Amino acid sequence: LNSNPEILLRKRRNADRTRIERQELAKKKREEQIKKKRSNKNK
RNA sequence: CCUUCGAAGAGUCGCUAAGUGGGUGGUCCAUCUAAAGCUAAUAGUCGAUCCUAAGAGAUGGGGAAGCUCCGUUUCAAAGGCCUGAUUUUAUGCAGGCC
């Protein structure tokens, strides 16, 4: 039926949720690093 | 040749030791240095093959001089599977289930 062969890449699964999770993880890591940095002045 | 030094085998000898100590002999003396070691002279289709039954019997462990025996899940690290942007001082696997 007059077709043309090609290669197709399927969409990655759960990319947006992974992106949001990574953004949240980065924010949490920054915040906890700040917490521990200013918590070490009372040693 | 001179001078300054100069260790010695323990559950062993005899319950369990000693360092001019100790072992063995002789009617005080004689002789050796244990408890370490080496050294020559006609079938895809019928059966088996598969499964478990009573039971037998490895592994783990224990006994016995040993040929071997007991014990069958027992104070055994007895193995499979899944998830993840690649795992935050920068690319040396983290978590979970039975």
UniProtKB/Swiss-Prot annotation:
Disordered: region residues: 1-41
Point to the regions of Basic and acidic residues compositional bias: 15-34
Q: Where in the cell is it found?
A: Nucleus, Nucleolus
Q: Which residues carry this modification: Phosphoserine?
A: 3
Q: Which domain of life is it from?
A: Eukaryota
The similarity comment for this entry is:
Belongs to the universal ribosomal protein uL30 family.
**What more does the entry say?**
Present with 7720 molecules/cell in log phase SD medium.
Outline what the protein does: Involved in the biogenesis of the 60S ribosomal subunit. May act as a specificity factor that binds precursor rRNAs and tethers the enzymes that carry out the early 5' to 3' exonucleolytic reactions that generate the mature rRNAs.
Q: What is this protein called?
A: Ribosome biogenesis protein RLP7
Give the fragment's position in the full-length protein: 12 to 54 of 322
